[model samples]
Target: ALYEDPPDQKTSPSGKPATLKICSWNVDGLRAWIKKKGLDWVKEEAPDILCLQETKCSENKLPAELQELPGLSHQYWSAPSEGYSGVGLLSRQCPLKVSYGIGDEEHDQEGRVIVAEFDSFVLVTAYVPNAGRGLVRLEYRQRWDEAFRKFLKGLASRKPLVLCGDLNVAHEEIDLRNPKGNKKNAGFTPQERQGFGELLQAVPLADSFRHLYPNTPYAYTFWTYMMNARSKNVGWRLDYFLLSHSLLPALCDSKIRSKALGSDHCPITLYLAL
Candidate 1:
């Protein structure tokens, strides 16, 4: 049931030089999104590996409809116990092995990370936890930053790595529309930014979005559920595609697909020459 394909479907782009199109998105709920937007966009995008965060579904309970995506023979997931924090990867190319969580059993309980080990690199999809209202989870979030950085470094020591997901923190004032107004807010707080900074410092990782389109404003990935944020284009660039230093040469372009929509967070795609 999970291995069917369209008759005319092509696995990779023609004459594209074995490039991998990687995408990251927070679909909110996998089942709801399929009904709202259909699965055609995925086929059209043709991402070799698609990472989804905030799936809101358990691994053992994936929707039957999603498992039938054409050309995607493999799927992996980490779903939270509390029904919120969930992440998944849909891969057309088979991975050598798949892992969930950061090797810490306590963190693994939340089901927030999934790593797909390929011949070239390890691809990770993470659904970072928000600091929550009034920065209630700030400390825990900071701890997670440390652990996540170590995890990526450990992977990088073995091979190149590409990490993409809803990082849940805006690293700079320019990353969000109303940074001055939301200085004390969870995602834009000073602590959160510093936490993200620390993670990047731990490993020689480059923010692919900024690397491609530096100094561009309004390049946001997430909009608010309230206040017609998407209509007004008031959002934050909390999602990202980060590449390890060694893979910098392979990074071609990084883009946020704001036009395509099914959830508050839009899809961010990275094109790699390799």
Candidate 2:
């Protein structure tokens, strides 16, 4: 891999090492995003690892540019249903092992989860299931949350975990622009929020962004195309960088790259020493 070495390493006063950046984005559609110069943006960001959700493309069907991103090798899982719910992991430093799904046959069909184990940590990227319009799929989403929470707990028992993805729920009222009005909406519904909270408690993970900026409001990652939501900054903080509690000392920064274009959801970055 051709990862550009940092000119200077930042160590703590206690002599802890430097930082590595991990970026996550729900690209909505990989093909459409690339057409809008998303790949150029990614090259400029140059994170140590990148996790993408909602790629909407199979690995075999990936465009040459995606297959050949400079200095990176990737693993991708496309949903058995074509052109939907896919995820991809691009790493500058190769992971020790990569696994798809949570080993649950029912939940594995969508290709929504990817677990990449590195030397010291495990990284999981997921495009969590959304409760469809009128809460039609809410029941399924609840079950998914349960299974996903269990899966993360299992992984955490082995090693500290870093989870980055579009988790599909806004955990708190402050996480969305119109929480009151959207109380019954999919992402902001009480059920969804509770599910997210349960996952956090179960896995014993910290919401990196929230942990760092508890009082920072209007920091959102996803926006709807309708009603010019992005321009108006009406959005939801659905994407996240969740780190195991034990990894808190290594946390450097968690940021929302809201300026990034080409997708309904912008990118989020997590900086960690490990």
Candidate 3:
């Protein structure tokens, strides 16, 4: 059953010396998972802010039970055509304002980006487009990457930004199980990896997980639904928490909650000292 928790009465744990726990996950299909695992996991993890991707349901079709998740009153969703790309954000703390899309009509149509503006930072969740099989959409994917980097930079100009979601590409060989074998594949191709590199070059954004544990290997966020991928540990670190360089000092720790799963992709958390 879906669980609900009333508005937390306590003051912001992000206050002076306190830390805020933030989490991100590409739930594959929000409605499907909610039915498979129920809403208990969300309540149990209790992140101050949660970014979700692949919600797979439009705003009007939002599952009634999801609205009951504990400590989550303010919510935003950018769900595309049914069963396609989408993104959502659930927060216990209210955002001063929120915006959907990345200021591009074509890409915006996919309902893949959502930004929540808070006093201290702008939180963004995105479900980046996959290049599709045989590199069919590589050109479009590159265009999207460039525009997305610009969008995030624009947000940073106003306030610190925390961007997280299923980025859909692994930036390095170390980020996936078989980089060489998948070099020509959609997620690990040279084109996709370079596109990610271009984002770092365009803006001072740091991948939170790598920033915390630079030497860690096989720290993956997603496993395939086929061939017992999880059991075999053939996974990829496609999801991420990216923070503007200015907010680096505020970062506490970044983790991949691989064990807590209702979808093919698992949850990743970031702790920030605000």
Candidate 4:
């Protein structure tokens, strides 16, 4: 599916279509990422924008290293409770407007969504709540997913959307190292997968990475530190960059930056034109 889809099928965002490099990652903790050269890696890529999830740091607790990155002049952070779920957006080209959460207090309290309006479109970074142990949180996740799906539609109605982050669900068997073994697990359950699929179908969105490497297996973004999983390249593709299907022509390339090691999850890059 990486092959180009007909351009006329999708609505292109307003503006002269040109290259815009974007990257997304879920750092288990913001401070710890800075301590591990995450900033250096970001500086090297020099992405026009960067989306981070699970920063787990409050506004005041945000580290200096990321705050000082040159060229990334605009920064937006959402950390409602602090030291928990949080997401961030950094852009060299500042966005016109910024918003936080999905307009729901229960979910907003954990800082799950950050929508930034740019010149051409909106980029939303989300740290989706996981199905807790023994699926205690499955029902809660269902409600959030439904709300998120609608939120994306609302955003797309105004302008195209680029949604990215640690969605926390695998969505497919190929997305993880041992899908069969993990079927009953939090991320691989049928309910979670169905919820994820609805978002893409209802929005007619493109799974940016899968669009580029559709059928490529053993590719992933998050690896548990337990059992030396990362060392063995055993991981899960939990992070993603999804776009309104109409924007396929603007997609240049999408990559998984697995070599980047600062936390359990690595960076995923999406290149867009306009």
TM-score of each: 0.91, 0.93, 0.92, 0.92
Task: Write out the backbone clash pairs for model 4.
Answer: 2-211, 10-246, 18-274
Among all windows of 10 consecutive residues in model 3, the one with the lowest summed lDDT is 1-10
Off by over 4 Å in 4: 1-18
Superposed Cα deviation of residue 103, candidate 4 (Å): 1.4
Residue 3 of model 3, lDDT score: 12
lDDT by residue for model 1 (1-274), tens: 0111113211223323437788788988888778778366787888888899988899788888778877776998888663587888999989999988999776678889998999988888999989899888988888888788888888888889899999999889879899999998989988889878877877768897787667777778888979988888888999999889787777667777887778888888887777
| Candidate 2 to truth, TM | 0.93
Residues 174-268, candidate 2: write the lDDT tens digits: 89889889988899888899999998999989998898788777788888999999888888999999989988888777878878898999998
Error of 1 at 145 (Å): 1.0
lDDT of each: 0.82, 0.86, 0.83, 0.84
Q: Distance (Å) between predicted and true CA of 14, model 3?
A: 14
* Highest-TM-score candidate: 2
Two-way lDDT contest, 1 vs 2, winner: 2
Candidate 3 residues lying further than 4 Å off, grouped into runs, are 1-18
RMSD (CA, angstroms), candidate 4: 4.6
Please, what are the lDDT tens digits per residue for candidate 4 over residues 117-235?
A: 98878889999999988999999999999988887888898898889999999979888998888888888889999988999998768898788678888888888899988888788
Better of 1 and 2 by TM-score: 2
List the candidate 1 regions with Cα displacement exceeding 4 Å: 1-18
Q: After superposition, which runs of candidate 2 have C-alpha atoms over 4 Å from their true positions?
A: 1-17
